[PDB]
UniProtKB/Swiss-Prot annotation:
Protein name in the entry: Peptidyl-prolyl cis-trans isomerase NIMA-interacting 1
Span of domain WW: 1-34
SMART domains, per the entry: WW (SM00456)
Gene name linked to the record: PIN1
Keyword Nucleus: yes
Subunit structure: Interacts with STIL. Interacts with KIF20B. Interacts with NEK6. Interacts (via WW domain) with PRKX. Interacts with BTK. Interacts (via PpiC domain) with DAPK1. Interacts with the phosphorylated form of RAF1. Interacts (via WW domain) with ATCAY; upon NGF stimulation. Interacts with PML (isoform PML-4). Interacts with BCL6. Interacts with FBXW7, disrupting FBXW7 dimerization and promoting FBXW7 autoubiquitination and degradation. Directly interacts with RBBP8/CtIP; this interaction depends upon RBBP8 phosphorylation.
């Protein structure tokens, strides 16, 4: 029971019963599913993401600032914060991706078009293919920094 990645947990020092995904890093009270077996995975998936980079990113630069100084932890604070804002409904994913993303895709609502396994960084890819149409991920790390993936197709 539970699609690839999913699991049942309980937050530290806080009695919370919810679902967690080891691949997407998504957290939610609601159960992801409710009999669709041998479902495997699609061959292609269109995705949008918002990327925050830190000092250890392969390319500590982006269209937002000539030189990235923020640390890993600081960049993670930002992701979380953007996630908090997305989920609360206070701010949609696209506008946040267009305002703060460190990938040139920011000028495209953060879209990346449909892709298949092979091109993207394995961490980002595994997440993307583990996400379902309309689902959003939790923090995702790659040599580019920390992402927030949103599968559109």
């Amino acid at each position: 029971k539970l699609p690839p990645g999913w699991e049942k947990r309980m937050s530290r020092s806080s009695g919370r019963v919810y679902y967690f995904n080891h691949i997407t890093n998504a957290s939610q009270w609601e159960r992801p599913s409710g009999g669709k077996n041998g479902q495997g995975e699609p061959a292609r998936v269109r995705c949008s993401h918002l990327l925050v980079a830190h000092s250890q990113s392969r390319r500590p630069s982006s269209w937002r600032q000539e030189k990235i100084t923020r640390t890993k932890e600081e960049a993670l604070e930002l992701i979380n914060g953007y996630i908090q804002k997305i989920k609360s409904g206070e701010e949609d994913f696209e506008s946040l991706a267009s305002q703060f993303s460190d990938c040139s895709s920011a000028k495209a609502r953060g879209d990346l078009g449909a892709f298949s396994r092979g091109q993207m960084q394995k961490p980002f890819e595994d997440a993307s293919f583990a996400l379902r149409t309309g689902e959003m991920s939790g923090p995702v790390f790659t040599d580019s920094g920390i992402h927030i993936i949103l599968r559109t197709e």
